[PDB]
Amino acid sequence: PKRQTNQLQYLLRVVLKTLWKHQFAWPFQQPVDAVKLNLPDYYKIIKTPMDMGTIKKRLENNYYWNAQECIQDFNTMFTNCYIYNKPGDDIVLMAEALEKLFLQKINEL
Amino acid sequence: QTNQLQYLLRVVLKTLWKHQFAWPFQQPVDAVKLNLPDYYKIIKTPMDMGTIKKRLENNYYWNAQECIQDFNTMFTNCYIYNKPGDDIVLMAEALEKLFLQKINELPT
């Protein structure tokens, strides 16, 4: 697909908009403030922080070269949650649902 | 008890207020804004350090025991609503231990 601005517009207008409205999206809509949340080893374990608020402004302001770079940021966001937290944590169940929905919608590019 | 209440404000409350664990307790739990529909059903007497601060600043307490009771209500509310091992319970237990260390030195 050559028109990579169009696939990125789809990721913003369809994919991200759908995920943003999900009831479990809110924990991933702002950066993790590890000091305020008392997560003392978060930035030591997570070396590439990522959140949907950052992805959104990057899509709105033409940061990405192509759709796969944006998809890469989504996957980093999900994996960060899986790495730092334990399996079965409430936030991990929320991340798994968003990722399943995310992978469901990128099939339709 | 002007002197004991002055101590509760300038030493006890201020010490907790400056701790980095103070922020969840510095304003009331707005269960509507926070999407906590069950909060007011479980917690019937909400209390926070912001409310305690305004009551001390406006001389709404008649004695120290009234003020101490509000602190304990705040801590118990957190223990009741959350589970042992929750992050916020660790913060509340540390703040309460700190609170008890300063209540030992309350004047007479």
């Binding site: 924990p27 | 922020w23 304003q27 804004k33 926070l34 929750d86």
Partner: peptide
């Protein structure tokens, strides 16, 4: 959805 409100919610989730 932001600032203290988001942080509080975030804290209670753990």
């Amino acid at each position: 959805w932001k600032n203290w409100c988001w942080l509080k919610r975030k804290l209670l989730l753990r």
